Design a protein around this ligand. Structure first.
Ligand SMILES: CC/C(=C\C=C\C(O)(C(F)(F)F)C(F)(F)F)c1cccc(CCc2ccc(CO)c(CO)c2)c1
Length: 253
């Protein structure tokens, strides 16, 4: 059966697409406002050198901080999100932050050279740039694999924004109070996504796509955990706080 999208589901998709268009700048025009990227010589991927310099951290931290602000903006536009208490809203935002950033960054990710390309050489981010910010291959390699896998799903923008919404409105996040309400909102979103795939996504992929998308959400949980561990290590580096931002410190601290 291929039921048609209800008027409510059509509205949801329209709202989410609009929300994304208002919070994701495909030209990355604000990136020049961040502290400048600095790339020190580290062909050997020396952890000691990377930690002593953290050359790319100010720039990446500003980019992630900027991204978190956009995600907060996007989340506020998710139908039903504002029906949640402020406490639950913040809990969901802090816990899904890095995951949603990983998902949204897929738009700049390119398989041409496996990088996040946001402009000229200066704003092209490779595995080496992320290691220069203090992260290790234990996170980066799996992240790249995740980006490629997501790219290969060839998601429609409608599916992309629904996936980000579903990621944010997860009832299984530690600290949530009204799990039932959150689950109701997520179910409304998941049903919209399943209905959309069944009647708008052409084969080969009309089906099976939903399961693959849900598996990406599970993958994100593992990446989230690894990122938290790496952030912990990074925070132990003296003077690291100045290289971050108040928003980043609160969300991951
Ligand atoms: C390895 C994971 C990570 C960031 C980690 C950052 C921090 O741990 C620290 F400290 F290092 F700064 C933080 F800030 F969290 F604390 C990361 C995840 C996904 C991508 C990228 C690459 C860059 C890119 C990001 C976001 C968007 C859009 O938001 C776009 C443009 O699409 C490009 C990096």
């Amino acid at each position: 059966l291929r039921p048609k999208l209800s008027e409510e589901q059509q509205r949801i998709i329209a709202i989410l697409l609009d929300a994304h268009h208002k919070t994701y700048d495909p030209t990355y025009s604000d990136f020049c406002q961040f502290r400048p990227p600095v790339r020190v010589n580290d062909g050997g991927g020396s952890v000691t050198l990377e930690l002593s310099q953290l050359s790319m951290l100010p720039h990446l931290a500003d980019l992630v901080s900027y991204s978190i602000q956009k995600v907060i903006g996007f989340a506020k536009m998710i139908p039903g999100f504002r029906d949640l208490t402020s406490e639950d809203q913040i809990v969901l935002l802090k816990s899904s932050a890095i995951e949603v950033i990983m998902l949204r960054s897929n738009e700049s990710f390119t398989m041409d050279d496996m990088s996040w390309t946001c402009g000229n050489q200066d704003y092209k981010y490779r595995v080496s740039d992320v290691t220069k910010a203090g992260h290790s291959l234990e996170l980066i390699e799996p992240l790249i694999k995740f980006q490629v896998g997501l790219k290969k799903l060839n998601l429609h923008e409608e599916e992309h924004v629904l996936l980000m919404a579903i990621c944010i409105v997860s009832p299984d996040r530690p600290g949530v109070q009204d799990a039932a309400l959150i689950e109701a909102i997520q179910d409304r979103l998941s049903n919209t996504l399943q209905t959309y795939i069944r009647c708008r996504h052409p084969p080969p992929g009309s089906h099976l796509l939903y399961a693959k998308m849900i598996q990406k959400l599970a993958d994100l949980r593992s990446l989230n955990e690894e990122h938290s561990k790496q952030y912990r290590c990074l925070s132990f580096q003296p003077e690291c706080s100045m290289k971050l931002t108040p928003l980043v410190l609160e969300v991951f601290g």
